[PDB]
Design a protein around this nucleic acid. Structure first.
Lengths: 190, 191
DNA sequence: GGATGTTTCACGTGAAACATCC
DNA sequence: GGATGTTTCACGTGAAACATCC
């Protein structure tokens, strides 16, 4: 890990516009984990960030003249890929955003579930079940982000026919996940 | 600490997480502002006060719809700055359970806060605050297993009240027992 | 009665087990 | 056979219930 001026690092225009909560950044600012960089295609002696955009922003706030980088050369697709795998590992994301990240890793980057799981540190089951939530009706996906349903609830009624009817039953009756599992079990499937 | 209308307080002109504020709001809703707000006479108004410490609970009380909130006309004592420093550090949530327990013990002893007070402040439940602190009563051996990972909070908490906890900890690790199992183990201690 | 000490157990998670597809 | 699709259920957390102290 080489020391580098904070001036000569730049964010990746290609990988989507990451925004971070002021609170989280003010916290980090106030708090020596190297930033993963690669030689800048735009400049010559400058580096581009592949991972650690938060700490970079935090270091700027903390007023450091020079910040620890760790360089490695990397295809534009590899930097897109690491960008998504980093974003998932952040605990900020919600389950639908998390599922999309898994779908994109699997489609556009031809990764196996088992691959994604090993990479992101969860289990394959989890990766699989998370993605399945994208198959749910819009109505049911609304309840997931509103908070009216939990992942556990939604996942247990994914395989049912007329999930919306079960979701309504769950909310009205304030049912547990265990209860919904028994409900969906004795209901037809599509 | 005199009770004062929420109307007559104002912020220091020189972000708080919705979740955290909704939580506090609801605590103040049930138990009321358990920790006085430090104020000083308003330079802007005349009969109004300006807040020196407790902007969060003020905002929380407004959400809870309290007509009047407990104030204390007082400046920031070095102990007040030590106190805020610890309460901020706990809220960060980077810290581990033993560090968390110490923070609660110090808030309770050196700053004479009630468990219920600490809970409302830091946003966990009283039980939790109580049970977390109890882990400090465990032998060093057992506290080692908590940070090593060999035991979980749930395990340790369930054998705190036992005599010879170390013997139970050894039983747990050797037998790879669940928390439910340890609860049944400790339950059949004689008393 | 209200602060503190301790136990009990319903909860959603998460991954292992099982089922089906490629 | 190994990836993927889905179900089942053991797990620790977390907070309400219970117990004890002043």
């Amino acid at each position: 890990s080489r020391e580098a001026p904070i001036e000569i690092l730049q964010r990746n225009p290609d990988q989507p516009r990451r925004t971070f909560r002021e609170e989280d950044l003010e916290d980090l600012s106030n708090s020596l984990q190297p930033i993963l960089v690669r030689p800048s295609p735009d400049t010559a002696g400058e580096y581009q960030i592949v991972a650690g955009e938060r700490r970079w922003r935090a270091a700027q706030r903390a007023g450091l003249k020079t910040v620890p980088i760790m360089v490695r050369e990397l295809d534009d697709l590899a930097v897109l890929e690491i960008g998504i795998i980093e974003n998932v590992q952040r605990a900020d994301l919600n389950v639908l955003e998390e599922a999309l990240s898994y779908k994109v890793l699997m489609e556009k980057f031809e990764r196996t579930q088992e691959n994604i799981a090993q990479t992101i540190g969860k289990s394959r089951s989890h990766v699989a079940n998370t993605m399945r939530l994208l198959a749910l009706p819009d109505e049911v996906q609304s309840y997931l982000v509103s908070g009216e349903l939990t992942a556990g609830h939604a996942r247990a009624i994914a395989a049912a026919a007329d999930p919306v009817a079960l979701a309504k039953q769950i909310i009205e009756g304030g049912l547990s996940v265990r209860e919904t599992e028994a409900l969906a079990r004795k209901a037809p499937n599509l």
